[PDB]
Amino acid sequence: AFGITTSSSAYVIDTNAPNQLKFTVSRSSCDITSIIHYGTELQYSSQGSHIGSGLGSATVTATQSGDYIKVTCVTDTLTQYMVVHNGDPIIHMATYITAEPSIGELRFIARLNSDLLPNEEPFGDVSTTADGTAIEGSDVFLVGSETRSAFYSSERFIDDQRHCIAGDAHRVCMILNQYESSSGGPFHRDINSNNGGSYNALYWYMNSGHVQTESYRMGLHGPYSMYFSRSGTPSTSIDTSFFADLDIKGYVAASGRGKVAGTASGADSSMDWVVHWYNDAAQYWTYTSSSGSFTSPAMKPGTYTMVYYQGEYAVATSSVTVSAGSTTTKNISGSVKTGTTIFKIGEWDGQPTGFRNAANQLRMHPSDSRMSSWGPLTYTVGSSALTDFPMAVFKSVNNPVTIKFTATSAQTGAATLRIGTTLSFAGGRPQATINSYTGSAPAAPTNLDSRGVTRGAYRGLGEVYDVSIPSGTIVAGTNTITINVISGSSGDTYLSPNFIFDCVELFQ
Ligand SMILES: C[C@@H]1O[C@@H](O[C@@H]2[C@H](O)[C@@H](O)[C@@H](O[C@H]3[C@H](O[C@@H]4[C@H](O)[C@@H](O)[C@@H](O[C@H]5[C@H](O[C@@H]6[C@H](O)[C@@H](O)[C@@H](O)O[C@@H]6C(=O)O)O[C@@H](C)[C@H](O)[C@H]5O)O[C@@H]4C(=O)O)O[C@@H](C)[C@H](O)[C@H]3O)O[C@@H]2C(=O)O)[C@H](O)[C@H](O)[C@H]1O
């Protein structure tokens, strides 16, 4: 039956789902210590499923409100909520914080039986580190001859409404339709799952210091939903609006929200367009249609910075105010301006898209034998393919990048060499030589104090480095550009100072 079974040490919540879902919540710690789905225990028995590594101690209450059961766990700065609906094999959750946890990240982790749930979806065994030997920190492993990381399960938050772990008789998915309290914007990615040897971990990283570009946000994180299937795959259309009736702290209901609608225009139409709104309280985003039309998700009232991307490259920024119960009509337009192009390597999309190893980097370590050579490589404009240009240059792996290009006598005037990047590590930034002419050393970029390129990430601050080339420095015939990554810092191989490339353009 749908209901709560109480003992001194626990509440057993029964969702009354057709294929059975009961779970045990510790009244002392708020740990999920047992999960029975279709007569089968799914929960790792040594460690609970919980926020972080455990709340440790919490004040726990359970109540029925009609066809809903709510479990509340209170700590000093964090309230954890679990809500179930009669008939549904889902643990709905929401996490209310007034401060960032001590550890400096906010995650939920489900620690589940890896024999029954060995697989990871949608990306496969790339995040299975079981039987792996660490090759970097304690988060990148070698399994046989293949490199592996929990990070290789990651996905841009804008595209991460569902990820799961699974076996032949059970599937457990995270359903994620509310990223408003997270940090890093639409292109932030994070750890999703990890079969690490003892159990298979399923996550939602509400926030983290993994390639973090923003301050943390307080208030209610989620709702998020952990779905339990036999062999089905749950839709991402899961109604959580019943949270409005359960006095969830920090919860703002539909009627407390407003929107922004309009049309974005002017950007590169070969790319997906994204509109992004943020302030200290909340962040929202949406893809636009191919005509540029957009309607924001339901937004908390307030004033927001509004950004228009082609790919992950901001072409315009603006400000907008949202009122509860109304739609603010707000258009946005803009484009990337350069000049008359001599050559262009890659595209202005805020990604290493198309470069050598770009597709692999998301799902493996740069040391992986399946990677193509890092170089040093000479890219000759007109003969070399884009997949011959390294996605990253490391001070101590493939430094420098040499570019060969032909110019006509009509192209010997003043130019700007533009070096567009996505993300830096250890102070990495480019200094350019063109023929016998050396550009200035730019100052160190902001340090994000995080590995990235070795952990499947590329979305950083997107620094752009322009070099003014005087007239008559470019010559008719062959020319040479040397891109050196400079930095006062030092490191072994892929942890040496580096940056990931976005686009390299020479224009007049
Ligand atoms: C090469 C490396 O580079 C630099 O590294 C720093 C930093 O020193 C390093 O720890 C790493 O930090 C990030 C990291 O993020 C990951 C997870 O989000 C985090 O929860 C953690 O996960 C582990 C965790 O285990 C718990 C506990 O830590 C264990 O000791 C044990 O008790 O079990 C606990 C448990 O909950 O089970 O959770 C497990 C489920 C998981 O399996 C564990 O991996 O670590 C992850 C990781 O990537 O290592 O940790 C958080 C707290 C931090 O905020 C992140 O920055 O990466 C940093 C960086 O990239 O800069 C340093 O130079 C370092 O010395 C060097 O070795």
Ligand SMILES: [Ca+2]
């Ligand atoms: Ca690019």
